[PDB]
Amino acid sequence: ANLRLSEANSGTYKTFIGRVREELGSETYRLYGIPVLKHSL
Amino acid sequence: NRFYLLTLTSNQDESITLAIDVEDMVAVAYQPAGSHESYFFLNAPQIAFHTLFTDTHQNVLNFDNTFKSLENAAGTTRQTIVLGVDPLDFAISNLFNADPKLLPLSFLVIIQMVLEASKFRFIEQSVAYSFKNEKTFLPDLAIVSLEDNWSEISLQIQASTSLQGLFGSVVELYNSNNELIEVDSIYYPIILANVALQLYHCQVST
Amino acid sequence: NECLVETRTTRISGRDALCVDVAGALTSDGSRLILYPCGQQVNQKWTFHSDGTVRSLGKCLATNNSKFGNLVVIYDCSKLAAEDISWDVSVGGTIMNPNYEDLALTSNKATRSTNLTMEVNTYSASQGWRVGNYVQPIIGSIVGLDDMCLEATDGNTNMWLEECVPNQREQSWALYSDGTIRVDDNRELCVTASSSTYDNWKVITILNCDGSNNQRWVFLADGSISTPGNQRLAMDVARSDVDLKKIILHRPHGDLNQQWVLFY
Ligand SMILES: OC[C@H]1O[C@@H](O[C@H]2[C@H](O)[C@@H](O)[C@H](O)O[C@@H]2CO)[C@H](O)[C@@H](O)[C@H]1O
Numbered sequence: 001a002n003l004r005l006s007e008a009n010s011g012t013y014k015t016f017i018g019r020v021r022e023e024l025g026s027e028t029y030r031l032y033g034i035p036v037l038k039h040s041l
Numbered sequence: 042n043r044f045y046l047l048t049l050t051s052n053q054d055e056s057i058t059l060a061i062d063v064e065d066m067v068a069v070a071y072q073p074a075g076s077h078e079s080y081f082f083l084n085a086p087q088i089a090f091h092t093l094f095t096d097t098h099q100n101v102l103n104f105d106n107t108f109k110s111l112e113n114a115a116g117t118t119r120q121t122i123v124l125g126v127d128p129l130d131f132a133i134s135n136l137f138n139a140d141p142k143l144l145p146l147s148f149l150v151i152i153q154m155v156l157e158a159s160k161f162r163f164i165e166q167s168v169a170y171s172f173k174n175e176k177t178f179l180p181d182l183a184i185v186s187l188e189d190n191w192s193e194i195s196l197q198i199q200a201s202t203s204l205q206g207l208f209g210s211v212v213e214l215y216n217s218n219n220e221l222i223e224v225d226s227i228y229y230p231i232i233l234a235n236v237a238l239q240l241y242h243c244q245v246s247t
Numbered sequence: 248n249e250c251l252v253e254t255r256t257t258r259i260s261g262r263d264a265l266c267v268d269v270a271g272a273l274t275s276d277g278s279r280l281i282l283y284p285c286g287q288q289v290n291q292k293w294t295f296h297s298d299g300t301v302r303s304l305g306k307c308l309a310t311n312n313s314k315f316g317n318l319v320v321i322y323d324c325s326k327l328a329a330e331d332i333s334w335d336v337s338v339g340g341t342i343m344n345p346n347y348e349d350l351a352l353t354s355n356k357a358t359r360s361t362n363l364t365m366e367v368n369t370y371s372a373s374q375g376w377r378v379g380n381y382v383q384p385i386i387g388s389i390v391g392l393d394d395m396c397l398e399a400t401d402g403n404t405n406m407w408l409e410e411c412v413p414n415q416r417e418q419s420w421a422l423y424s425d426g427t428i429r430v431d432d433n434r435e436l437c438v439t440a441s442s443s444t445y446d447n448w449k450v451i452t453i454l455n456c457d458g459s460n461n462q463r464w465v466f467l468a469d470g471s472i473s474t475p476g477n478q479r480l481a482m483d484v485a486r487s488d489v490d491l492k493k494i495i496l497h498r499p500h501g502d503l504n505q506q507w508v509l510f511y
């Protein structure tokens with residue numbers, strides 16, 4: 001999960017936040033469709 | 042594996058690697074690229090010292106990763122520090138160089154722009170606007186109230202599942218004209234749109 | 248810091264920001280439900296319970312054709328049967344009794360003192376409610392693909408994404424307790440899924456608010472602006488081209504064109 005500022009814009013910044021959320025947020029456990037943070041990794 | 046690493050590189054190709062405790066969604070430690078020093082918050086969990094950055098001299102910083110301690114250590118409030126592409130760039134450099142006189146403030150930029158941005162889409166978009174429009178912002182009550190209330194919101198989302206989506210206790214948030222919204226149920230976009238990741242409190246099902 | 252919530256008192260608001268209100272504060276078993284403008288009165292206050300009942304004035308909200316007809320009404324909990332006072336709130340605004348599986352709480356017209364009723368579930372702007380003590384419409388911008396804000400355009404007739412401006416009156420919206428996204432300057436105008444289509448999908452545009460199921464919208468956890476119900480479709484810039492200037496309600500593939508953000 002690398003955010004490189006020298007060639008960064010809102011697009012790649014959002015994709016980066018996207019990657020953080022995808023790897024931190026649980027796939028199985030969500031409540032009202034909001035994921036709980038993962039137990040392990 | 043309990044920790045999650047991500048890498049922030051600067052405008053000079055200076056890279057740091059930051060470590061997030063997945064359990065509480067806080068930064069525990071970081072390492073500048075090609076450096077034998079690694080730096081740990083005073084309240085970083087033991088396992089972090091024993092698992093992360095083992096091939097380095099691990100230094101204990103003079104504050105904890107709590108907002109209160111970063112604010113007292115930087116001498117200012119989140120309500121004063123500006124966020125944006127350039128101040129991020131600068132914060133990355135400061136952490137790379139391990140400058141002690143800037144560190145707490147350098148963290149306040151990084152944490153807000155990455156960890157608080159991952160927690161709330163409102164904060165994410167506030168930051169994306171800095172990149173888009175080339176211009177920076179220092180957070181008002183609206184971002185500060187979300188940051189400050191993340192754990193309570195998480196607990197109240199989980200709690201509501203025992204009573205038709207209603208909270209156990211009111212959660213005071215603010216809008217972008219600094220006006221008070223007393224949220225007290227899941228049925229607001231302020232909560233449901235906004236929160237992208239929630240802190241575990243209880244084992245409950247929807 | 249406890250996850251069990253036993254008892255709670257909030258208030259229920261709906262179409263055109265009107266509150267669920269027990270008729271004239273009258274307490275007798277069989278007193279009528281109405282929409283009334285919001286306020287600090289004990290008849291408008293509602294208390295939810297672990298068993299499933301919702302009460303005002305010591306007595307639970309009830310629905311039964313055999314006793315009261317079509318109408319909705321407060322009645323004593325101990326005397327009444329068990330099934331006519333269970334309730335369930337759903338994430339996209341639907342208040343309904345599980346025991347009457349086809350049905351849903353409804354205000355048939357939007358104007359003060361309307362009697363509320365249980366009607367067949369069409370997932371309509373009228374059948375939609377916001378449960379929560381904050382009853383005012385949530386004002387702010389809507390930001391979509393490429394950090395463009397939704398703009399009410401062409402004398403407020405047609406809506407599409409334009410580039411952000413601070414405090415443009417037409418770029419702000421007001422999300423109402425009923426489900427509707429109203430224009431900030433004018434509230435009689437509202438967002439709607441129109442009958443005119445593009446590539447076999449309905450074009451979204453503004454119209455006068457009637458309270459139909461073309462007009463009820465919900466902000467989902469995935470970041471979509473979506474329709475309520477098991478079948479789901481979401482708001483969508485068509486093919487991510489702002490130049491076309493049209494939003495289409497589509498099957499929720501959940502890509503960036505269907506990502507939105509309430510920037511309040
Ligand atoms: O009739 C609907 C309406 O009642 C209002 O209270 C009335 C009350 O019913 C009447 O007896 C009295 O003379 O005037 C009151 C208003 O000043 C409630 O305030 C309103 O919410 C509705 O429930």
Ligand SMILES: OC[C@H]1O[C@@H](O[C@H]2[C@H](O)[C@@H](O)[C@H](O)O[C@@H]2CO)[C@H](O)[C@@H](O)[C@H]1O
Pocket residue numbers: 483484485486487497500504
């Ligand atoms: O144009 C509306 C529409 O786009 C579909 O995706 C298109 C894409 O825009 C186009 O560039 C490509 O050539 O074909 C795709 C379809 O196969 C979306 O799938 C649909 O949801 C709409 O958003």
